[PDB]
Structure 1
Amino acid sequence: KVFGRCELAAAMKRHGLDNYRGYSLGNWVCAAKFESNFNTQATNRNTDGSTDYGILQINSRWWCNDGRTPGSRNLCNIPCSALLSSDITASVNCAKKIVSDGNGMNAWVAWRNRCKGTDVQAWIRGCRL
């Protein structure tokens, strides 16, 4: 599923991601834009053999099981394929664990390089919410 911008903002807010660990909704929408282009089916292979999955490009080295990242963890206790669902519940629940793990949203490379420090509230402009 390719979400619209406000559609994704609304889904994230409903699932309690807005202001989670102090990160306003626009931070999360910006992160999703540049991680996945709002596409729940996005995947990307990393140099270490891990893969990033879904709307928030969650990495199999730490967070989910894909059976092909030897020596990795599965800290969200989920198959990585669950992070590709049109329903973003699994991705949001896992993202809450990630952003709580010490480094905040710096876990998302695209957030750190393209969203952090910018006018992220613009990502929810026009949305009813």
Structure 2
Amino acid sequence: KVFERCELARTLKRLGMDGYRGISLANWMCLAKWESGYNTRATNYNAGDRSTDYGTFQINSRYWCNDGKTPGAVNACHLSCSALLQDNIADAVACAKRVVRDPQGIRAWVAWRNRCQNRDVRQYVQGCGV
């Protein structure tokens, strides 16, 4: 499904993302906007290394979820990558939380560095009531 901005902002807040490991709600919103455009069924195959990115946060199959076809992959979130394509984002959020527990934090997604870091991200949550 494709979330509307404020709809997603409120959902993420309810799921405990605001300030999780020092990451503000607006940063998560900026990441979701640039990764999938708030689309839960988004998938991107990376032909260079045989991995695929799944769902709202475009979580990679080499380290986080298992899709069975990615070489030398681990499944740190202990989830089928299929779980990251559901309309209910509960699992994708649990897994995103795992991703940032690593040293890099939110920096794990290059898209965050390119389009969110050091920028004014207030706009992603303004008027949503979060």
TM-score by length of structure 2 reads: 0.97
Residue 17 of structure 1 corresponds to 17
Distance 1:73 1:63 in 2: 7
Counting matched residue pairs gives 129
User: Secondary structure in 1 aligned to 2:17?
Assistant: coil
Deviation at 1:40, TM superposition (A): 0.1
Distance 2:122 2:30 in 1: 9
Distance 1:63 1:20 in 2: 18
Contact map agreement 1:41 1:53 (CA 8 A) in 2: yes
User: Unaligned 5+ residue runs, structure 1?
Assistant: none
Deviation at 1:4, TM superposition (A): 0.4
- Is residue 87 of structure 2 the alignment partner of residue 86 of structure 1? yes
Percent identity between the two aligned chains: 60
User: Unaligned 5+ residue runs, structure 2?
Assistant: none
Contact map agreement 1:60 1:74 (CA 8 A) in 2: yes
- Is residue 57 of structure 2 the alignment partner of residue 65 of structure 1? no
Contact map agreement 1:30 1:120 (CA 8 A) in 2: yes
Deviation at 1:122, TM superposition (A): 1.6
Contact map agreement 1:36 1:55 (CA 8 A) in 2: yes
Residue 27 of structure 2 corresponds to 27
Residue 108 of structure 2 corresponds to 107
Matched residue type, 1:86: D
Q: Which runs of 4+ in 1 moved over 6 A?
A: none
TM-score by length of structure 1 reads: 0.98
User: Secondary structure in 2 aligned to 1:8?
Assistant: helix
Matched residue type, 1:108: W
Matched residue type, 1:58: I
Deviation at 1:76, TM superposition (A): 0.1
After superposition, what is the alpha-carbon deviation per residue over 1:66-121, rounded to whole angstroms, capped at 9, x for unaligned? 01102100000000010010011011000111011110111112111101111112
Distance 1:118 1:58 in 2: 23
User: Secondary structure in 2 aligned to 1:63?
Assistant: coil
User: Secondary structure in 1 aligned to 2:92?
Assistant: helix
